[PDB]
Design an enzyme around this catalytic site. Structure first.
Site, PDB file in Angstrom:
ATOM      1  N   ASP A  24      42.787  23.035  43.621  1.00  0.00           N
ATOM      2  CA  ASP A  24      42.680  22.866  42.079  1.00  0.00           C
ATOM      3  C   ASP A  24      43.583  23.822  41.322  1.00  0.00           C
ATOM      4  O   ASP A  24      43.723  23.818  40.187  1.00  0.00           O
ATOM      5  CB  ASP A  24      41.198  23.153  41.761  1.00  0.00           C
ATOM      6  CG  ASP A  24      40.812  24.759  41.905  1.00  0.00           C
ATOM      7  OD1 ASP A  24      41.731  25.431  42.704  1.00  0.00           O
ATOM      8  OD2 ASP A  24      39.809  25.234  41.522  1.00  0.00           O
ATOM      9  N   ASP A 198      35.428  47.868  32.634  1.00  0.00           N
ATOM     10  CA  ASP A 198      36.010  47.288  31.985  1.00  0.00           C
ATOM     11  C   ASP A 198      35.768  47.907  30.204  1.00  0.00           C
ATOM     12  O   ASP A 198      34.604  47.970  30.031  1.00  0.00           O
ATOM     13  CB  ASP A 198      35.951  45.580  31.837  1.00  0.00           C
ATOM     14  CG  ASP A 198      36.449  45.161  30.694  1.00  0.00           C
ATOM     15  OD1 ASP A 198      37.975  45.114  31.072  1.00  0.00           O
ATOM     16  OD2 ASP A 198      36.168  44.765  29.823  1.00  0.00           O
ATOM     17  N   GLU A 252      37.784  51.982  32.926  1.00  0.00           N
ATOM     18  CA  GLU A 252      38.928  51.639  32.188  1.00  0.00           C
ATOM     19  C   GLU A 252      38.980  52.226  30.771  1.00  0.00           C
ATOM     20  O   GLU A 252      38.191  51.681  29.842  1.00  0.00           O
ATOM     21  CB  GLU A 252      39.238  50.206  31.842  1.00  0.00           C
ATOM     22  CG  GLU A 252      40.481  49.673  31.317  1.00  0.00           C
ATOM     23  CD  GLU A 252      40.339  48.484  30.176  1.00  0.00           C
ATOM     24  OE1 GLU A 252      39.285  48.043  29.982  1.00  0.00           O
ATOM     25  OE2 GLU A 252      41.596  47.730  30.057  1.00  0.00           O
TER      26      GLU A 252
HETATM   27 CA   LIG Z   1      40.713  27.203  44.320  1.00  0.00          CA
END
Ligand SMILES: [Ca+2]
Length: 554
Positions: A24, A198, A252
Site C-alpha cells: 500500500d 507531543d 517535546e
Molecule cells: Ca503497509
C-alpha cells in the site's frame, strides 16, 4: 548508578515511512518488526515510534480518534504486541508517542462534545463565543488561519492550536484529565518502556483567552506554553501515573523559553525525566517557521552550551539533530553536496554521540539521507505547507514560488521520504507506490550498500555507538566547550571519574588547525573521520582535513 536511559542510544522510527510489508506504500508494524536485527546490529538500545493509534491521518497519527486501538494502516493490536515481544527478545525497549494536547475531531469525545452545549463531554474541549462578530480572540493556528473554528450546531468556536481537525483537549476539566491517566495506564500495563509527550508545554490554556499582544503575536508558539496550571497538571500526571511504573518520560517542549525547561525536567520536581528542546534545531529558522536565517558554528555551539547549562545537576537532556518535524540533519547542519555529504554526515554523527544527554538518531541519518529535491508545491504532503500557502500566498504576502524555494529547505516532508533500504524499486521500502516519493539519490544512499562498507556513514555510526557504550564519560560525563566563540572548529571535553575525552570537529570544508588547551595532550585516539593519520601520543595540537571529526582520550 544513573538510570538506564541516561546511557542508552535511541532511534526514532516514523512507522509510516520505515518499512511497508503489503504494497500500500505506507510503512507498518510488520515492516518495523522485520528490521529489528538491523536496529540491534546498529547498536540501538531503544526505539521511539511516532504515533501508532487509530487516526484519520489528517496529520499522520497526531490526530487520534481512539487512544486504545492501533492505526489500521500499521496493522493490529496483535502486530503491536508482536513488536514488543520481538524487541524484548533482543533486550530493546519501546518508547511510544503520547498525543494529549489534542485529539482528532473524529474522537467519540469530540463527536459528543460538539453535539450540544449541555452534554457530559462539552468541557472535554474548549468552546467559546465569538467577539465583535468574529473569533473569540486573535489566536493563530500552526496549520493556518485561526486557532478557533465555529460550529453552527452550537454557534460557538472550538480551539485548535494545530489543525482544524485536531481540537485541543481541556485539561482544566478533572474528568478529562482522569480519562487521560486511565489511557496512559492502558499502554503502560502492556509494558511500554517510555512515553514521549507531543507539545507537552501547551496543555495549560490562559484563563479568559485574552488577545495576544502584537509582540506575542509574532511568537505565538511561546505564548501557548505560558498556561498558569501547566506544572500542576504535569505533577498530577506523574503522581497518578508515572510514579507507579518504571517507564521514562520525555517532553517535546516546543516553543517554551529555555529558562523554563528546568521546571519540566528537574528530577526533584517529579514531572518529566528528559527534555526535547528546539533552540538548536530551530537556531537558524525565522519566527514564521518557513524562512531560514544564516547562522554559524558559533551560534550552533553557544545554543548547545546554553541548553546543556539548563539541565544542571538534576535535569536531563535528549540530544537530536533531526526528527519527523524538521529538515534532514546533513542538509541542515552539514553540507549535503555529493563531495561533502559523507564526510559531514560522519562529523555530525560524532557530535550526536558525544553530547551530554540521551541521543536520538532519526531514521535514515545513519545512512546520510538528505533533503528531498521538491519541484512543485504539489510534491508536499505536509499540512504545515498547506497552512503557509493559506497564510502567506492566498493573502498576497508571498508568491507560490517564494514559498516553494523556502519551504523546500525547511519542510517536515524532507524527513518523511521513505527510508532507503537498498537500490531496488523504490529503495526496497515498498513494492507498491510509496505514499511520499523516494529521493532519487537512493541508488547511491541505501542501507544495503552502507552496511557492506567499513568506510560508510552507517559503519561509522555503528562504531561510534560501540565507543559510546564502552566509555561512560561520553554519556553521563560533564561537558565543557573549549572555545564558544570559534566558528570553524567545534571542540569540547567530556569527563568522568578522572578520565577526560576531547572531541574535535571541523565544520569547514577546508583544512584548519586546532591547538589543544595549554597542558592538555592526546593520550589515545579512539576514532576519526576523514583523517589520513591519528595524532601522536603527546600531541599539543592537530591538523584537520575538511570536515574531519575525532574523539581522543587526553
Ligand atoms: Ca503497509
Amino acid at each position: 548508578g544513573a538510570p538506564w536511559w541516561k546511557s542508552a542510544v535511541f532511534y526514532q522510527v516514523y512507522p509510516r515511512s520505515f518499512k511497508d510489508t503489503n504494497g500500500d506504500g505506507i510503512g507498518d508494524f510488520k515492516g518495523l518488526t522485520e528490521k529489528l536485527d538491523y536496529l540491534k546490529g546498529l547498536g540501538i538500545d531503544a526505539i521511539w515510534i511516532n504515533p501508532h493509534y487509530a487516526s484519520p491521518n489528517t496529520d499522520n497519527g497526531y490526530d487520534i480518534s481512539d487512544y486504545r486501538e492501533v492505526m489500521k494502516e500499521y496493522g493490529t493490536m496483535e502486530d503491536f504486541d508482536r513488536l514488543m515481544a520481538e524487541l524484548k527478545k533482543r533486550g530493546m525497549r519501546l518508547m511510544v508517542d503520547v498525543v494529549i494536547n489534542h485529539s482528532s475531531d473524529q474522537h467519540e469525545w469530540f463527536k459528543s462534545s460538539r453535539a450540544s452545549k449541555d452534554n457530559p463531554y462539552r468541557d472535554y474541549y474548549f468552546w467559546r463565543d465569538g467577539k465583535d462578530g468574529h473569533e473569540p480572540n486573535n489566536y493563530p493556528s500552526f496549520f493556518g488561519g485561526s486557532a478557533w473554528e465555529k460550529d453552527p450546531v452550537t454557534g460557538q468556536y472550538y480551539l485548535h492550536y494545530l489543525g482544524r481537525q485536531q481540537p485541543d483537549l481541556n485539561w482544566d476539566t478533572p474528568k478529562l484529565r482522569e480519562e487521560l491517566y486511565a489511557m496512559l495506564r492502558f499502554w503502560l500495563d502492556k509494558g511500554v518502556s517510555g512515553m514521549r509527550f507531543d507539545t507537552v508545554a501547551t496543555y495549560s490554556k490562559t484563563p479568559g483567552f485574552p488577545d495576544l499582544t502584537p509582540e506575542q503575536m509574532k511568537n505565538f508558539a511561546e505564548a501557548y506554553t505560558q498556561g498558569p496550571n501547566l506544572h500542576r497538571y504535569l505533577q498530577e500526571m506523574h503522581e497518578k501515573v508515572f510514579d507507579h511504573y518504571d517507564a521514562v518520560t520525555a517532553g517535546e517542549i516546543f516553543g517554551a523559553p529555555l529558562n523554563q525547561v528546568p521546571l519540566f525536567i528537574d528530577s526533584r520536581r517529579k514531572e518529566l525525566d528528559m527534555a526535547f528542546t528546539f533552540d538548536l534545531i530551530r537556531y537558524d529558522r525565522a519566527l514564521d517557521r518557513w524562512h531560514t536565517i544564516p547562522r554559524t558554528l558559533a551560534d550552533f555551539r553557544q545554543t548547545i552550551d546554553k541548553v546543556d547549562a539548563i539541565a544542571g545537576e538534576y535535569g536531563w537532556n535528549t540530544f537530536f539533530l533531526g526528527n519527523h518535524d524538521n529538515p534532514r540533519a546533513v542538509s541542515h547542519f552539514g553540507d549535503d553536496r555529493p563531495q561533502w555529504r559523507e564526510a559531514s554526515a560522519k562529523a555530525l554523527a560524532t557530535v550526536t554521540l558525544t553530547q551530554r544527554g540521551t541521543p536520538f538518531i532519526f531514521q535514515g541519518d545513519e545512512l546520510g539521507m538528505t533533503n528531498y529535491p521538491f519541484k512543485t508545491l504539489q510534491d508536499f504532503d505536509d499540512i504545515e505547507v498547506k497552512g503557509f500557502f493559506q497564510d502567506y500566498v492566498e493573502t498576497g504576502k508571498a508568491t507560490a514560488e517564494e514559498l516553494l524555494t523556502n519551504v523546500a529547505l525547511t519542510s517536515r516532508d524532507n524527513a518523511r521520504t521513505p527510508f532507503q533500504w537498498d537500490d531496488s524499486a523504490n529503495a526496497g521500502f515498498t513494492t507498491g507506490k510509496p505514499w511520499l516519493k523516494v529521493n532519487p539519490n537512493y541508488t547511491e544512499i541505501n542501507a544495503a550498500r552502507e552496511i557492506g562498507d567499513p568506510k560508510s556513514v552507517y559503519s561509522f555510526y555503528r562504531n561510534l555507538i560501540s565507543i559510546r557504550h564502552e566509555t561512560p564519560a561520553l554519556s553521563t560525563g560533564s561537558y565543557r566547550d573549549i572555545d564558544p566563540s570559534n566558528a570553524d572548529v567545534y571542540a569540547y571535553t567530556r569527563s568522568q571519574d578522572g578520565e577526560t575525552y576531547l572531541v574535535v570537529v571541523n565544520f569547514k570544508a577546508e583544512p584548519r588547525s586546532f591547538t589543544l588547551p595549554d597542558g592538555m595532550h592526546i593520550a589515545e585516539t579512539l576514532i576519526e573521520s576523514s583523517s589520513p593519520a591519528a595524532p601522536a601520543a603527546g600531541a599539543a595540537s592537530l591538523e584537520l582535513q575538511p570536515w574531519q571529526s575525532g574523539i581522543y582520550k587526553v
